[PDB]
């Protein structure tokens, strides 16, 4: 990959010099990962830059820097120091030479800046953006965001705002920037045990990435296997992936397994949070069951443990977690990235609700929106459909000798 330019873009002007306090859910997050790649194709530089500065007027926390206070608690120091925007060019080109089946791999890590977090926090950009053009109109947007500034939803809002501005339009949107709403009460009064942050079950006493497609003529069936109640397609798919991995890993029947589902609390908090709330609201929801009960009983049981676990996270339960996390012994060791989604556990983060394919700059809309590289096993990305099909794709990492099976049980609905 060749590089034409590298610019540290700061807001167009007039930005507050805040220091944003961060809510407990603004601190417990898996690392600074959350990378993303956007793939474009032809349709029917001097503008992408100024649109970023214009979009950094309302979203000034993105142009800030990471900082600790006197207690070591992480903050967002609104420096206005800027966001890194790179415009790359590839000689070899052929976007699908490059992306091929769009499955994540190390070559996607090259559509993204290198950046050393190990350095001092106050002097790396919280967000980096790369624009890599190809041979006949292929474009690639790489996004690398720090978790302590905003969640995925608030990050996609920015990319959409940036794209809406580059189109020659205007944002309409003012972000709500105040994390004191999710402040735990004084004193913390937990009402639940909160097994979400309990240690995961242990397996009873590098890798291969896999991208899998679910047509619409597959999701129909899952809705056909639904019974007292009747569950939804995503709840079936999720349990289907839970069921498949429990069989792909050859788990013993009496083993406890844990599914780490990220949950958006913006809508279930009373009173409801403001629109365009800028921050991290992602709460953890962990349904659990024995490995045998998932795979021996019908698929609607796997949704039963998933649905009843998500339906328990009401305003009384979410605010009880904020009080709960205030009492934890170490602030960021509940952060568990590299070996929590080990066997027999797993994690499923879904993007089937974020307006992902709304990043039209003028080159059309994305054909692809997905993660750059799979770090390790256990994390399932529920991709959204771009062609309006009603489809649903998933990307996944597993041990090299569990993927050949996992591919065989996923295809059988």
Residue numbers in the entry: 3 to 46, 55 to 215, 240 to 261, 266 to 451
The authors write:
One interesting example is the hydroxycinnamoyl-CoA:shikimate hydroxycinnamoyltransferase (HCT), which belongs to the BAHD acyltransferase family involved in the biosynthesis of a diversity of ester- and amide-containing natural products. HCT produces p-coumaroylshikimate by transferring the p-coumaroyl group from the acyl donor p-coumaroyl-CoA to the acyl acceptor shikimate. It is an essential enzyme in the phenylpropanoid metabolism, conserved across all land plants. Interestingly, unlike many other essential metabolic enzymes, HCT exhibits relatively low affinity toward its native substrate shikimate and can utilize a variety of non-native substrates.
We crystallized the HCT ortholog from the lycophyte Selaginella moellendorffii and solved its apo structure at 2.9-Å resolution. The SmHCT crystal had a space group of P212121, and contained two molecules in the asymmetric unit. Several surface loops of the protein (residues 47-54, 216-237, and 259-262) have low electron density support and are omitted from the model. Similar to other HCT orthologs, the structure of SmHCT consists of two pseudo-symmetric domains: one comprised of residues 1-179 and 392-411, the other of 241-391 and 412-451, and a long intervening loop consisting of residues 180-240. The SmHCT active site is located at the interface between its two domains with a cavity volume of 1372.2±10.4 Å3. Inside the active site, the universally conserved catalytic His157 acts as a general base to deprotonate the 5-hydroxyl of shikimate, priming it for the subsequent nucleophilic attack on p-coumaroyl-CoA. Apart from His157, two other key residues involved in substrate binding and catalysis, Thr385 and Trp387, are also structurally conserved in SmHCT compared to other available HCT structures. However, there is a clear structural difference in the arginine handle, Arg372, which resides on one of the three short loops (L1) surrounding the entrance of the active site and coordinates the shikimate carboxylate with two salt bridges throughout the catalytic cycle. A lack of electron density for its side chain suggests that this residue is extremely flexible in SmHCT, occupying many different conformations in the apo state. This is in clear contrast to other crystallized HCT orthologs, which have defined density for the arginine handle.
